[PDB]
């Protein structure tokens, strides 16, 4: 299976660097044009840079040149984007492909250009088909991800969109609703990673 | 034009050996060369890419390298599945691509003289007109011998064809045909055939007399 | 998962026209250039043609230009080479290949081009003498002759007999038929005990010759 698997997201502060790297495996990065694209929260996608196959030219967008750098490492089959000087207006998702038609993608990875500190989640139980959940309070940056029993529960999980509080730090909530008759013998468990700080917390949710 | 001149034509070398395959382009390619391997039979492989860049699963035994417009292959220690034939190649456009001619990397052994046999033509063949004469070397080394084919003393011109097997995977000896080809006719007014093979400082002839068994 | 399969080889008379085909598997042949290369027997690769990637630009050697045309179908994920004016000197293994740094080949398919007709070999013995002059050995054959086109595959004994056989690479004659010999060497004792068969199987005439070798 080709794979394109990114690293080195996260918060920088303004003026700030951070180096992605786009790991390749399944195929010769020699051979593939990779590029680097972005989504700024809830926008369309936008083209940054660009580097060719053999020879390795370079294009970028206008208002990242002078400031951005795309390469690749063939002996380690990694493709890089150095970001300097980031800006507010540089927070996005960003994503790295092969060819024109971009027909594999990474995963994505959330930067964040800001000067407030990272800070890990709180998480509260919404006690109890009966309805239950996790309440995921006052974090920052994004991104969060939410599991049931260690990913075992899938069906009928409802993670919600965060929003920004009047705090400026994330807030959400991730439900699930289930059978009643399992709320004596089951137990659940929401398992909840904040990788920019560091932390997951894992909180048993129990009837009331 | 590019060319893509290769060094040695040929090597021999023993397993474990240090092999050195240089090629050299007519003007610069940048870095834009690859290297191949093949063997008799088989679709090329490719080697290395860029010049230095060894592909992937390639042991690495295999290093590329540049130096301007000279572009080496070496094998630091040779592996028997490394006896084959390598070839440079330029991409890097205006041809778009040029191959170099080629190294054989053949086995060392000691010099082998060849079993030299002549076989008449059947009497089946006569009956149709046309006479087949063959020559065998057999199992000998190194590669390079000159056969040629007398008929009652006279040197034979431009009435035979010779062809060579690769060299033996057991013995790295190689093996050589030689036909001599007349009409039933010519064969018949004429009484010794020989062949003779020459190697160095020695000839050897395989002679037969047309009708003494 | 990456293969590259030809098809199309074959025979056809001076001037006339043959289409290679390179089906690809496991990659889409859009986002990669696609490349002809070519071996006559004996001898190196030299580069046919090449169309790039995306826009499908097409490149040719000096010796097929105005002749060939190589080409993509996208929608069947195949290259082509289509062979037109073809000429005796064009007789080739043709291999399809990927990338500029040719990372996967096709099989290779034989190209012949000739007047000749097909027609399979006549199998003449190359009699061993019953009484040695090379020591205890003795050197026994069938001579393959005068068959059309390339290529034949020889076995001995139906496959029972494999030490010491040597069979040659063909030659071409000047009649346009090719020829070869096929040879062993045996212990000159077991001449009066054990049968040698030469099998010659000719697929382009769908012919085989069993040719049993007896002393002379
Ligand atoms: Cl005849
Ligand atoms: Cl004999
Ligand atoms: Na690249
Ligand atoms: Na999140
Ligand atoms: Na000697
Ligand atoms: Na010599
Ligand atoms: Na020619
Ligand atoms: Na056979
Ligand atoms: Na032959
Ligand atoms: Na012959």
């Known amino acids: 299976e080709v794979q394109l698997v990114e690293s080195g997201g996260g918060l920088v502060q303004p003026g700030g660097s951070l180096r992605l790297s786009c790991?390749?495996?399944?195929?010769?990065?020699?051979?593939?044009?990779?590029?680097?694209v972005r989504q700024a929260p809830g926008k369309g996608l936008e083209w940054?840079?660009?580097?060719?196959?053999?020879?390795?030219?370079?294009?970028?967008?206008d208002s990242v040149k002078g400031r951005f750098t795309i390469s690749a490492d063939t002996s380690k089959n990694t493709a890089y984007l150095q970001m300097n000087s980031l800006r507010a207006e540089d927070t996005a998702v960003?994503?790295?492909?092969?060819?024109?038609?971009?027909?594999?993608?990474?995963?994505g990875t959330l930067v964040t250009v800001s000067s407030a500190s990272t800070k890990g989640p709180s998480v509260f139980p919404l006690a109890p088909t009966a309805a239950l959940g996790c309440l995921v309070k006052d974090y920052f940056p994004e991104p969060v991800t939410v599991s049931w029993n260690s990913g075992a529960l899938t069906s009928g999980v409802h993670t919600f969109p965060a929003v920004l509080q009047s705090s400026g730090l994330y807030s959400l909530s991730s439900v699930v609703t289930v059978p009643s008759s399992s709320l004596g013998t089951q137990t659940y468990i929401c398992n909840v990673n904040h990788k920019p700080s560091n932390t997951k917390v894992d909180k048993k949710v129990e009837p009331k | 034009d590019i060319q893509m001149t290769q060094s040695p034509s040929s090597l021999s070398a023993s397993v474990g050996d240090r092999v050195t395959i240089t090629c050299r382009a007519s003007?610069?390619?940048?870095?834009?060369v690859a290297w191949y391997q093949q063997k008799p039979g088989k679709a090329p492989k490719l080697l290395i890419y860029?010049?230095?860049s060894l592909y992937s699963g390639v042991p690495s035994r295999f290093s590329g390298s540049r130096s301007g417009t000279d572009f080496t292959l070496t094998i630091s220690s040779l592996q028997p599945e490394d006896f084959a034939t390598y070839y440079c190649?330029?991409?890097?456009?205006?041809?778009?691509?040029?191959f170099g001619q080629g190294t054989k990397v053949e086995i060392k052994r000691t010099v082998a003289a060849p079993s030299v046999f002549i076989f008449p033509p059947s009497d089946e063949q006569l009956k149709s007109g046309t006479a087949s004469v063959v020559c065998l070397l057999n199992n000998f080394y190194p590669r390079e011998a000159k056969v040629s084919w007398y008929v009652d003393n006279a040197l034979q011109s431009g009435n035979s064809q010779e062809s060579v097997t690769e060299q033996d995977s057991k013995d790295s000896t190689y093996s050589l045909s030689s036909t001599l080809t007349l009409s039933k006719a010519d064969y018949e007014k004429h009484k010794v055939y020989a062949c003779e093979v020459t190697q160095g400082t020695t000839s050897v002839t395989k002679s037969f007399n047309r009708g003494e068994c | 998962e990456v293969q590259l399969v030809e098809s199309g080889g074959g025979l056809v008379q001076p001037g006339g026209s043959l289409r290679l085909s390179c089906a690809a598997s496991?990659?889409?042949?859009?986002?990669?250039?696609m490349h002809w290369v070519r071996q006559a027997p004996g001898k190196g690769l030299e580069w046919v043609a090449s169309?790039?990637?995306?826009?499908?630009?097409?490149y040719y050697a000096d010796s097929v230009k105005g002749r060939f045309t190589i080409s993509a179908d996208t929608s069947k994920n195949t290259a082509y080479l289509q062979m037109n004016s073809l000429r005796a000197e064009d007789t080739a293994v043709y291999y399809c290949?990927?990338?500029?740094?040719?990372?996967?080949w096709g099989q290779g398919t034989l190209v012949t081009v000739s007047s000749a007709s097909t027609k399979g070999p006549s199998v003449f013995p190359l009699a061993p003498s019953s009484k040695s002059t090379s020591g205890g050995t003795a050197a026994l054959g069938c001579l393959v002759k005068d068959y059309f086109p390339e290529p034949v595959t020889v076995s001995w004994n139906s496959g029972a007999l494999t030490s010491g056989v040597h069979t040659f690479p063909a030659v071409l004659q000047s009649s346009g038929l090719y020829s070869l010999s096929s040879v062993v060497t045996v212990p000159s004792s077991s001449l009066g005990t054990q049968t040698y068969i030469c099998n010659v199987n000719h697929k382009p005439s769908n012919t085989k010759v069993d040719k049993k070798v007896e002393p002379k």
């Open positions: 290949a990927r990338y500029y740094a040719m990372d996967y």
């Open positions: 496991g990659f889409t042949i859009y986002y990669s250039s």
């Open positions: 169309i790039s990637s995306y826009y499908g630009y097409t």
């Open positions: 003007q610069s390619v940048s870095s834009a």
């Open positions: 860029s010049a230095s």
């Open positions: 190649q330029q991409y890097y456009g205006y041809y778009p691509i040029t």
